[PDB]
Short mmCIF file of N, CA, C and O and ligand atoms in Angstrom, two decimals:
data_model
loop_
_atom_site.label_atom_id
_atom_site.label_comp_id
_atom_site.label_asym_id
_atom_site.label_seq_id
_atom_site.Cartn_x
_atom_site.Cartn_y
_atom_site.Cartn_z
N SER A 275 105.68 75.57 81.72
CA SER A 275 105.16 75.97 83.05
C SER A 275 105.84 77.24 83.57
O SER A 275 107.05 77.39 83.45
N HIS A 276 105.02 78.14 84.13
CA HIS A 276 105.42 79.46 84.63
C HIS A 276 105.08 79.51 86.12
O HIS A 276 104.18 78.81 86.57
N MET A 277 105.83 80.32 86.88
CA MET A 277 105.57 80.48 88.31
C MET A 277 104.18 81.09 88.48
O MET A 277 103.43 80.68 89.37
N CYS A 278 103.84 82.04 87.59
CA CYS A 278 102.56 82.71 87.63
C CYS A 278 101.42 81.75 87.33
O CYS A 278 100.27 82.13 87.48
N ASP A 279 101.71 80.50 86.93
CA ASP A 279 100.62 79.55 86.73
C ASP A 279 99.74 79.39 87.98
O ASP A 279 98.54 79.18 87.81
N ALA A 280 100.30 79.46 89.21
CA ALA A 280 99.57 79.47 90.48
C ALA A 280 98.44 80.49 90.50
O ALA A 280 97.54 80.39 91.33
N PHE A 281 98.56 81.52 89.67
CA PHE A 281 97.63 82.64 89.72
C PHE A 281 96.65 82.54 88.57
O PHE A 281 95.61 83.20 88.59
N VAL A 282 96.96 81.70 87.57
CA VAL A 282 96.12 81.68 86.39
C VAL A 282 94.75 81.11 86.73
O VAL A 282 94.63 80.11 87.44
N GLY A 283 93.72 81.74 86.16
CA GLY A 283 92.36 81.23 86.33
C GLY A 283 91.37 82.36 86.50
O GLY A 283 91.76 83.52 86.37
N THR A 284 90.12 81.99 86.75
CA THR A 284 89.07 82.95 87.02
C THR A 284 88.78 82.94 88.51
O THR A 284 88.48 81.88 89.09
N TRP A 285 88.83 84.14 89.12
CA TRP A 285 88.76 84.29 90.55
C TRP A 285 87.58 85.20 90.91
O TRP A 285 87.42 86.24 90.28
N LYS A 286 86.78 84.81 91.90
CA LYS A 286 85.62 85.59 92.34
C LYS A 286 85.88 86.09 93.75
O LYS A 286 86.45 85.40 94.57
N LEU A 287 85.42 87.31 94.05
CA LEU A 287 85.57 87.88 95.39
C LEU A 287 84.71 87.10 96.39
O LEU A 287 83.52 86.94 96.18
N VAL A 288 85.32 86.71 97.52
CA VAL A 288 84.55 86.04 98.55
C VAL A 288 84.52 86.82 99.87
O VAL A 288 83.61 86.60 100.64
N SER A 289 85.54 87.64 100.16
CA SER A 289 85.49 88.48 101.34
C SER A 289 86.34 89.73 101.15
O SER A 289 87.27 89.76 100.35
N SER A 290 86.01 90.75 101.95
CA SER A 290 86.71 92.02 101.90
C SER A 290 86.74 92.62 103.30
O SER A 290 85.76 92.50 104.02
N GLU A 291 87.88 93.21 103.65
CA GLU A 291 88.04 93.91 104.90
C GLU A 291 88.82 95.20 104.63
O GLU A 291 89.90 95.20 104.03
N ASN A 292 88.22 96.32 105.08
CA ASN A 292 88.82 97.64 105.04
C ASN A 292 89.01 98.20 103.63
O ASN A 292 89.87 99.07 103.41
N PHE A 293 88.18 97.79 102.67
CA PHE A 293 88.32 98.30 101.32
C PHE A 293 87.86 99.76 101.24
O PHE A 293 88.50 100.55 100.58
N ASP A 294 86.76 100.07 101.92
CA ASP A 294 86.30 101.45 101.94
C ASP A 294 87.40 102.35 102.51
O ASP A 294 87.71 103.40 101.95
N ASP A 295 88.02 101.93 103.61
CA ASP A 295 89.09 102.69 104.23
C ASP A 295 90.26 102.88 103.27
O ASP A 295 90.82 103.98 103.20
N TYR A 296 90.64 101.82 102.57
CA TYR A 296 91.75 101.89 101.62
C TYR A 296 91.43 102.90 100.52
O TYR A 296 92.25 103.74 100.17
N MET A 297 90.21 102.83 100.00
CA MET A 297 89.74 103.74 98.96
C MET A 297 89.73 105.19 99.47
O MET A 297 90.12 106.11 98.75
N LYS A 298 89.31 105.39 100.71
CA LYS A 298 89.36 106.75 101.27
C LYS A 298 90.79 107.26 101.30
O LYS A 298 91.04 108.43 101.01
N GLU A 299 91.74 106.43 101.72
CA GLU A 299 93.14 106.83 101.82
C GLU A 299 93.70 107.26 100.45
O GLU A 299 94.55 108.15 100.39
N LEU A 300 93.18 106.68 99.36
CA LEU A 300 93.56 107.06 98.01
C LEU A 300 92.84 108.28 97.47
O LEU A 300 93.11 108.70 96.35
N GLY A 301 91.83 108.74 98.20
CA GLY A 301 91.06 109.90 97.78
C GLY A 301 89.90 109.56 96.83
O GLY A 301 89.42 110.44 96.09
N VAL A 302 89.44 108.30 96.88
CA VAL A 302 88.32 107.87 96.06
C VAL A 302 87.05 108.53 96.57
O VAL A 302 86.78 108.50 97.76
N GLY A 303 86.23 109.04 95.65
CA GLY A 303 85.01 109.75 96.00
C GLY A 303 83.89 108.85 96.52
O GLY A 303 83.87 107.64 96.30
N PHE A 304 82.92 109.46 97.17
CA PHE A 304 81.85 108.77 97.85
C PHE A 304 81.09 107.83 96.91
O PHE A 304 80.89 106.65 97.24
N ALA A 305 80.66 108.32 95.75
CA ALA A 305 79.79 107.52 94.88
C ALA A 305 80.53 106.28 94.36
O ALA A 305 79.96 105.17 94.30
N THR A 306 81.80 106.45 93.99
CA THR A 306 82.60 105.33 93.52
C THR A 306 82.78 104.34 94.66
O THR A 306 82.64 103.13 94.44
N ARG A 307 83.07 104.84 95.86
CA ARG A 307 83.28 103.94 96.98
C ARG A 307 82.02 103.14 97.27
O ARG A 307 82.11 101.95 97.52
N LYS A 308 80.85 103.77 97.23
CA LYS A 308 79.64 103.06 97.60
C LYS A 308 79.34 101.97 96.58
O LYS A 308 78.99 100.85 96.94
N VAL A 309 79.38 102.33 95.31
CA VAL A 309 79.01 101.37 94.28
C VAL A 309 80.10 100.31 94.14
O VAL A 309 79.78 99.12 94.00
N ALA A 310 81.36 100.70 94.13
CA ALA A 310 82.42 99.70 93.96
C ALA A 310 82.44 98.79 95.18
O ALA A 310 82.74 97.60 95.05
N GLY A 311 82.15 99.30 96.36
CA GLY A 311 82.25 98.52 97.58
C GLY A 311 81.23 97.37 97.59
O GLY A 311 81.46 96.31 98.17
N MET A 312 80.11 97.61 96.89
CA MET A 312 78.98 96.71 96.75
C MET A 312 79.23 95.59 95.76
O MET A 312 78.51 94.60 95.72
N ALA A 313 80.16 95.85 94.84
CA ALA A 313 80.27 95.02 93.66
C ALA A 313 80.98 93.71 93.97
O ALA A 313 81.59 93.53 95.02
N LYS A 314 80.83 92.81 93.01
CA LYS A 314 81.24 91.41 93.14
C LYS A 314 82.13 91.07 91.94
O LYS A 314 81.72 90.33 91.04
N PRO A 315 83.35 91.61 91.91
CA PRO A 315 84.22 91.49 90.76
C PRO A 315 84.79 90.09 90.64
O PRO A 315 85.11 89.44 91.63
N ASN A 316 84.94 89.71 89.38
CA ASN A 316 85.80 88.59 89.05
C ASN A 316 87.07 89.06 88.36
O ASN A 316 87.05 90.01 87.58
N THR A 317 88.15 88.30 88.58
CA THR A 317 89.40 88.57 87.93
C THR A 317 89.81 87.35 87.11
O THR A 317 89.89 86.26 87.67
N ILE A 318 90.02 87.54 85.81
CA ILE A 318 90.60 86.54 84.94
C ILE A 318 92.08 86.85 84.76
O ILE A 318 92.44 87.88 84.18
N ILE A 319 92.93 85.92 85.22
CA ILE A 319 94.37 86.04 85.12
C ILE A 319 94.87 85.03 84.11
O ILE A 319 94.60 83.84 84.27
N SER A 320 95.63 85.50 83.12
CA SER A 320 96.15 84.65 82.07
C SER A 320 97.60 85.02 81.78
O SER A 320 98.06 86.13 82.05
N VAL A 321 98.32 84.04 81.25
CA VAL A 321 99.70 84.23 80.90
C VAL A 321 99.88 83.75 79.47
O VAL A 321 99.39 82.69 79.09
N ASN A 322 100.62 84.51 78.69
CA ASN A 322 100.92 84.15 77.31
C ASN A 322 102.36 84.56 77.06
O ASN A 322 102.67 85.75 76.95
N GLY A 323 103.25 83.57 77.08
CA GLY A 323 104.67 83.84 77.14
C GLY A 323 105.05 84.65 78.38
O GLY A 323 104.79 84.25 79.51
N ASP A 324 105.65 85.81 78.12
CA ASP A 324 106.12 86.72 79.14
C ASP A 324 105.03 87.71 79.56
O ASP A 324 105.24 88.50 80.50
N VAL A 325 103.91 87.74 78.84
CA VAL A 325 102.88 88.75 79.08
C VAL A 325 101.82 88.18 80.01
O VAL A 325 101.20 87.16 79.70
N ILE A 326 101.60 88.86 81.13
CA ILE A 326 100.56 88.53 82.07
C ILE A 326 99.40 89.52 81.88
O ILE A 326 99.63 90.73 81.75
N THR A 327 98.18 89.00 81.85
CA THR A 327 96.98 89.82 81.74
C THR A 327 96.10 89.58 82.96
O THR A 327 95.84 88.44 83.32
N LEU A 328 95.68 90.69 83.60
CA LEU A 328 94.76 90.69 84.72
C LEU A 328 93.54 91.50 84.28
O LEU A 328 93.62 92.73 84.12
N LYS A 329 92.41 90.83 84.10
CA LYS A 329 91.18 91.44 83.61
C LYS A 329 90.09 91.33 84.66
O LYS A 329 89.79 90.23 85.12
N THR A 330 89.50 92.48 84.99
CA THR A 330 88.48 92.61 86.00
C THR A 330 87.14 92.81 85.30
O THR A 330 87.02 93.70 84.47
N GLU A 331 86.13 92.05 85.72
CA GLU A 331 84.78 92.23 85.20
C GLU A 331 83.83 92.37 86.37
O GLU A 331 83.93 91.64 87.35
N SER A 332 82.94 93.35 86.28
CA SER A 332 81.94 93.55 87.30
C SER A 332 80.83 94.39 86.69
O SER A 332 80.95 94.86 85.56
N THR A 333 79.81 94.67 87.51
CA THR A 333 78.76 95.57 87.08
C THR A 333 79.19 97.03 87.26
O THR A 333 78.50 97.91 86.74
N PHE A 334 80.28 97.26 87.98
CA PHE A 334 80.73 98.62 88.25
C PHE A 334 81.57 99.11 87.08
O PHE A 334 81.27 100.09 86.41
N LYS A 335 82.64 98.37 86.84
CA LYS A 335 83.63 98.71 85.85
C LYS A 335 84.31 97.43 85.39
O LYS A 335 84.51 96.50 86.17
N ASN A 336 84.69 97.43 84.12
CA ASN A 336 85.56 96.40 83.58
C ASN A 336 86.91 97.06 83.32
O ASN A 336 86.95 98.14 82.75
N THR A 337 88.00 96.44 83.76
CA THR A 337 89.34 96.96 83.54
C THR A 337 90.27 95.80 83.16
O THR A 337 90.01 94.65 83.53
N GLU A 338 91.40 96.14 82.53
CA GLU A 338 92.38 95.14 82.12
C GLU A 338 93.76 95.80 82.20
O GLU A 338 93.90 96.98 81.83
N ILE A 339 94.75 95.08 82.72
CA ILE A 339 96.14 95.44 82.53
C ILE A 339 96.87 94.22 81.97
O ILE A 339 96.58 93.08 82.31
N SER A 340 97.78 94.49 81.04
CA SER A 340 98.74 93.51 80.57
C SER A 340 100.13 94.05 80.81
O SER A 340 100.36 95.26 80.65
N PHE A 341 101.06 93.18 81.19
CA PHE A 341 102.39 93.66 81.55
C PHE A 341 103.41 92.53 81.48
O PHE A 341 103.05 91.35 81.40
N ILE A 342 104.68 92.91 81.52
CA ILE A 342 105.80 92.00 81.66
C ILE A 342 106.44 92.29 83.01
O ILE A 342 106.58 93.46 83.38
N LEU A 343 106.78 91.24 83.75
CA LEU A 343 107.34 91.39 85.08
C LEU A 343 108.58 92.26 84.98
O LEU A 343 109.40 92.08 84.09
N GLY A 344 108.68 93.22 85.90
CA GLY A 344 109.87 94.04 86.04
C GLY A 344 109.94 95.23 85.09
O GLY A 344 110.93 95.97 85.13
N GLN A 345 108.94 95.40 84.22
CA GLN A 345 108.98 96.45 83.21
C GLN A 345 107.87 97.45 83.50
O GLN A 345 106.69 97.13 83.45
N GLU A 346 108.30 98.68 83.84
CA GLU A 346 107.38 99.73 84.21
C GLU A 346 106.39 100.01 83.09
O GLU A 346 106.75 100.01 81.91
N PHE A 347 105.15 100.30 83.47
CA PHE A 347 104.13 100.68 82.51
C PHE A 347 103.26 101.78 83.08
O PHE A 347 103.09 101.89 84.28
N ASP A 348 102.71 102.59 82.18
CA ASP A 348 101.69 103.54 82.57
C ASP A 348 100.36 102.81 82.74
O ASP A 348 99.96 102.06 81.88
N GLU A 349 99.70 103.06 83.87
CA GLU A 349 98.40 102.50 84.19
C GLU A 349 97.45 103.65 84.55
O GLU A 349 97.82 104.60 85.25
N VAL A 350 96.21 103.55 84.07
CA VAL A 350 95.13 104.43 84.50
C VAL A 350 94.18 103.55 85.30
O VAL A 350 93.56 102.64 84.75
N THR A 351 94.10 103.81 86.60
CA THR A 351 93.39 102.94 87.53
C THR A 351 91.88 103.18 87.43
O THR A 351 91.43 104.13 86.79
N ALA A 352 91.12 102.33 88.11
CA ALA A 352 89.67 102.37 88.08
C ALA A 352 89.12 103.63 88.75
O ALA A 352 87.98 104.00 88.48
N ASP A 353 89.93 104.29 89.61
CA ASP A 353 89.57 105.57 90.20
C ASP A 353 90.27 106.73 89.46
O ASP A 353 90.38 107.82 90.02
N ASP A 354 90.75 106.46 88.24
CA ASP A 354 91.22 107.49 87.33
C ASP A 354 92.52 108.13 87.81
O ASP A 354 92.78 109.29 87.53
N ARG A 355 93.37 107.36 88.53
CA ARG A 355 94.72 107.83 88.81
C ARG A 355 95.61 107.40 87.65
O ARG A 355 95.47 106.30 87.13
N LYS A 356 96.54 108.27 87.29
CA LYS A 356 97.52 108.03 86.24
C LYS A 356 98.82 107.67 86.93
O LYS A 356 99.50 108.54 87.44
N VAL A 357 99.15 106.36 86.97
CA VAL A 357 100.23 105.88 87.82
C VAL A 357 101.29 105.20 86.97
O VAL A 357 101.03 104.77 85.84
N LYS A 358 102.51 105.19 87.50
CA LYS A 358 103.57 104.37 86.96
C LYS A 358 103.53 103.07 87.75
O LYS A 358 103.67 103.09 88.97
N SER A 359 103.39 101.94 87.06
CA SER A 359 103.27 100.63 87.71
C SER A 359 104.42 99.71 87.34
O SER A 359 104.82 99.65 86.18
N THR A 360 104.87 98.95 88.34
CA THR A 360 105.82 97.88 88.11
C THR A 360 105.36 96.68 88.91
O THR A 360 105.06 96.83 90.08
N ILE A 361 105.32 95.51 88.26
CA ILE A 361 104.89 94.28 88.90
C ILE A 361 106.04 93.29 88.79
O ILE A 361 106.59 93.09 87.72
N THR A 362 106.35 92.68 89.94
CA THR A 362 107.42 91.71 90.04
C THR A 362 106.89 90.53 90.82
O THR A 362 105.86 90.59 91.47
N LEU A 363 107.63 89.44 90.72
CA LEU A 363 107.33 88.22 91.44
C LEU A 363 108.43 88.06 92.47
O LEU A 363 109.59 87.93 92.09
N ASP A 364 108.06 88.12 93.75
CA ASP A 364 109.01 88.08 94.84
C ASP A 364 108.65 86.92 95.76
O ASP A 364 107.63 86.97 96.45
N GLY A 365 109.47 85.87 95.78
CA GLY A 365 109.22 84.75 96.68
C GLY A 365 107.79 84.22 96.53
O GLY A 365 107.13 83.95 97.54
N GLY A 366 107.33 84.11 95.28
CA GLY A 366 106.01 83.56 94.98
C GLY A 366 104.84 84.56 95.05
O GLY A 366 103.70 84.20 94.73
N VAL A 367 105.11 85.81 95.46
CA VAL A 367 104.07 86.83 95.63
C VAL A 367 104.17 87.80 94.45
O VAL A 367 105.26 88.26 94.13
N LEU A 368 103.04 88.10 93.81
CA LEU A 368 103.02 89.12 92.77
C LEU A 368 102.90 90.48 93.47
O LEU A 368 101.89 90.74 94.13
N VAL A 369 103.92 91.31 93.30
CA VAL A 369 104.01 92.60 93.98
C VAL A 369 103.87 93.71 92.94
O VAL A 369 104.70 93.87 92.06
N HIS A 370 102.82 94.52 93.12
CA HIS A 370 102.47 95.58 92.19
C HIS A 370 102.61 96.94 92.90
O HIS A 370 101.92 97.16 93.89
N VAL A 371 103.55 97.79 92.46
CA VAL A 371 103.74 99.12 93.04
C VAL A 371 103.23 100.13 92.02
O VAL A 371 103.59 100.08 90.85
N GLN A 372 102.41 101.07 92.52
CA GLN A 372 101.96 102.21 91.73
C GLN A 372 102.50 103.50 92.35
O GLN A 372 102.40 103.70 93.57
N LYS A 373 103.06 104.33 91.48
CA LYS A 373 103.57 105.66 91.85
C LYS A 373 102.80 106.74 91.10
O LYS A 373 102.65 106.66 89.88
N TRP A 374 102.39 107.80 91.83
CA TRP A 374 101.78 108.96 91.21
C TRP A 374 101.84 110.11 92.21
O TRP A 374 101.79 109.89 93.42
N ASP A 375 102.01 111.34 91.70
CA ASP A 375 101.90 112.55 92.51
C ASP A 375 102.72 112.44 93.79
O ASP A 375 102.33 112.98 94.83
N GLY A 376 103.88 111.80 93.68
CA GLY A 376 104.79 111.55 94.79
C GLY A 376 104.27 110.58 95.85
O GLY A 376 104.88 110.45 96.91
N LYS A 377 103.15 109.90 95.57
CA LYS A 377 102.56 108.90 96.45
C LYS A 377 102.88 107.49 95.94
O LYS A 377 103.35 107.31 94.81
N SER A 378 102.57 106.48 96.76
CA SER A 378 102.81 105.09 96.41
C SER A 378 101.77 104.21 97.10
O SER A 378 101.42 104.44 98.25
N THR A 379 101.32 103.17 96.39
CA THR A 379 100.54 102.10 96.99
C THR A 379 101.04 100.77 96.43
O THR A 379 101.51 100.68 95.29
N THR A 380 100.98 99.76 97.28
CA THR A 380 101.43 98.44 96.91
C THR A 380 100.26 97.48 97.02
O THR A 380 99.55 97.49 98.02
N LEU A 381 100.14 96.64 95.99
CA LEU A 381 99.13 95.59 95.88
C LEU A 381 99.85 94.25 95.78
O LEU A 381 100.62 94.08 94.86
N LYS A 382 99.64 93.37 96.76
CA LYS A 382 100.28 92.05 96.76
C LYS A 382 99.22 90.98 96.59
O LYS A 382 98.18 91.00 97.24
N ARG A 383 99.55 90.03 95.71
CA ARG A 383 98.70 88.88 95.48
C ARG A 383 99.45 87.61 95.84
O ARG A 383 100.54 87.39 95.31
N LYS A 384 98.84 86.78 96.69
CA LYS A 384 99.49 85.53 97.05
C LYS A 384 98.48 84.40 97.09
O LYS A 384 97.29 84.63 97.33
N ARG A 385 98.98 83.19 96.83
CA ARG A 385 98.15 82.01 96.94
C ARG A 385 98.27 81.46 98.34
O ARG A 385 99.39 81.30 98.84
N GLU A 386 97.13 81.22 98.96
CA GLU A 386 97.05 80.67 100.31
C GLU A 386 95.93 79.65 100.29
O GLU A 386 94.78 80.02 100.01
N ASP A 387 96.28 78.36 100.45
CA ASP A 387 95.28 77.32 100.26
C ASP A 387 94.68 77.47 98.87
O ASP A 387 95.44 77.66 97.92
N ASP A 388 93.35 77.39 98.74
CA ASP A 388 92.68 77.52 97.46
C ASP A 388 92.28 78.96 97.18
O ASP A 388 91.53 79.20 96.25
N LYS A 389 92.87 79.90 97.92
CA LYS A 389 92.50 81.30 97.80
C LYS A 389 93.59 82.07 97.07
O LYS A 389 94.77 81.76 97.15
N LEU A 390 93.16 83.18 96.46
CA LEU A 390 94.07 84.23 96.04
C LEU A 390 93.78 85.42 96.96
O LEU A 390 92.63 85.86 97.06
N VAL A 391 94.80 85.79 97.75
CA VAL A 391 94.65 86.83 98.77
C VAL A 391 95.34 88.09 98.25
O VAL A 391 96.52 88.07 97.91
N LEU A 392 94.58 89.20 98.23
CA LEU A 392 95.07 90.51 97.81
C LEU A 392 95.20 91.39 99.06
O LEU A 392 94.24 91.54 99.83
N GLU A 393 96.43 91.86 99.27
CA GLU A 393 96.72 92.81 100.32
C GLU A 393 97.05 94.15 99.68
O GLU A 393 97.97 94.28 98.87
N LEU A 394 96.26 95.16 100.07
CA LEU A 394 96.39 96.51 99.56
C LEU A 394 96.85 97.42 100.69
O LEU A 394 96.24 97.41 101.76
N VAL A 395 97.88 98.20 100.41
CA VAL A 395 98.44 99.06 101.45
C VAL A 395 98.58 100.48 100.91
O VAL A 395 99.19 100.69 99.87
N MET A 396 97.96 101.43 101.61
CA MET A 396 98.16 102.86 101.35
C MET A 396 98.35 103.58 102.69
O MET A 396 97.45 103.56 103.53
N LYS A 397 99.52 104.18 102.87
CA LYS A 397 99.86 104.84 104.13
C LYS A 397 99.67 103.81 105.24
O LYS A 397 100.23 102.72 105.15
N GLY A 398 98.88 104.10 106.27
CA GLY A 398 98.76 103.13 107.36
C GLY A 398 97.72 102.03 107.15
O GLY A 398 97.62 101.10 107.97
N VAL A 399 96.93 102.15 106.09
CA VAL A 399 95.76 101.30 105.91
C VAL A 399 96.08 100.05 105.10
O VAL A 399 96.56 100.16 103.98
N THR A 400 95.76 98.87 105.66
CA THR A 400 95.82 97.60 104.92
C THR A 400 94.39 97.12 104.70
O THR A 400 93.57 97.11 105.61
N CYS A 401 94.12 96.75 103.46
CA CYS A 401 92.89 96.07 103.09
C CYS A 401 93.24 94.66 102.63
O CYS A 401 94.24 94.47 101.95
N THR A 402 92.43 93.70 103.04
CA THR A 402 92.57 92.34 102.55
C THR A 402 91.30 91.95 101.80
O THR A 402 90.21 92.04 102.36
N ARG A 403 91.48 91.46 100.56
CA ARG A 403 90.39 90.92 99.77
C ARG A 403 90.75 89.49 99.37
O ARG A 403 91.86 89.26 98.92
N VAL A 404 89.79 88.58 99.55
CA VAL A 404 90.04 87.16 99.32
C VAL A 404 89.19 86.75 98.14
O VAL A 404 88.01 87.06 98.07
N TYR A 405 89.82 85.97 97.24
CA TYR A 405 89.18 85.47 96.04
C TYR A 405 89.32 83.95 95.97
O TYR A 405 90.32 83.41 96.44
N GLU A 406 88.31 83.29 95.39
CA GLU A 406 88.32 81.84 95.16
C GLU A 406 88.06 81.56 93.68
O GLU A 406 87.52 82.38 92.98
N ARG A 407 88.42 80.36 93.19
CA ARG A 407 88.17 80.02 91.79
C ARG A 407 86.67 79.99 91.48
O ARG A 407 85.88 79.47 92.27
N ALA A 408 86.29 80.55 90.33
CA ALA A 408 84.89 80.62 89.93
C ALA A 408 84.35 79.23 89.61
O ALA A 408 85.15 78.39 89.13
C1 Q1I B 585 87.09 100.15 92.10
C2 Q1I B 585 88.18 99.16 92.39
C3 Q1I B 585 89.45 99.62 92.77
C4 Q1I B 585 89.77 101.10 92.83
C5 Q1I B 585 89.55 101.63 94.18
C6 Q1I B 585 90.90 101.52 94.84
C7 Q1I B 585 91.89 101.77 93.73
C8 Q1I B 585 91.18 101.43 92.47
N1 Q1I B 585 90.48 98.77 93.07
C9 Q1I B 585 90.26 97.42 92.98
N2 Q1I B 585 91.33 96.49 93.27
C10 Q1I B 585 91.10 95.62 94.38
C11 Q1I B 585 92.71 96.91 93.15
C12 Q1I B 585 93.01 97.19 91.69
C13 Q1I B 585 93.14 98.02 94.09
C14 Q1I B 585 89.02 96.92 92.61
C15 Q1I B 585 88.87 95.44 92.50
N3 Q1I B 585 88.34 94.58 93.37
N4 Q1I B 585 88.46 93.33 92.83
N5 Q1I B 585 89.03 93.53 91.61
N6 Q1I B 585 89.31 94.83 91.37
C16 Q1I B 585 87.97 97.78 92.31
C17 Q1I B 585 86.73 97.24 91.94
C18 Q1I B 585 86.47 97.08 90.58
C19 Q1I B 585 85.24 96.54 90.16
C20 Q1I B 585 84.28 96.16 91.11
C21 Q1I B 585 84.54 96.30 92.48
C22 Q1I B 585 85.76 96.87 92.89
CL1 CL B 586 92.78 89.83 92.01
#
């Protein structure tokens, strides 16, 4: 048993607040924002030993990251940013920091009731996206 077991499973988007705003703060273009904002992504989270995999499937884009907690990795995001990423587990919350071009954004995932709640922060903007088991 792993702490990340709380996160393992297939998760579907059920609500979103301020995602367009968050995407604007990152400099995401209009067409990507419109189509991605519309989409209904699922996330499959799996653990295999020390390696955690987060795989996104949608009609917009499919993406995958695999990582070990605390070990920096190069990530190319869905909006084509080339970032240095580090993901850690802090007091039960998966905390993902991305660094690029002297900027930073933090993505936090936490379990709340039967939900997986994603809090995205860029500069002053917080977006909350809520996911439930598929
Ligand atoms: C385009 C996109 C983005 C980019 C815009 C902001 C930075 C990258 N970030 C996402 N999440 C929430 C994280 C990684 C920030 C998601 C996403 N939403 N749920 N899972 N992934 C999506 C998304 C993918 C496919 C279908 C719809 C939306
Ligand atoms: Cl997620």
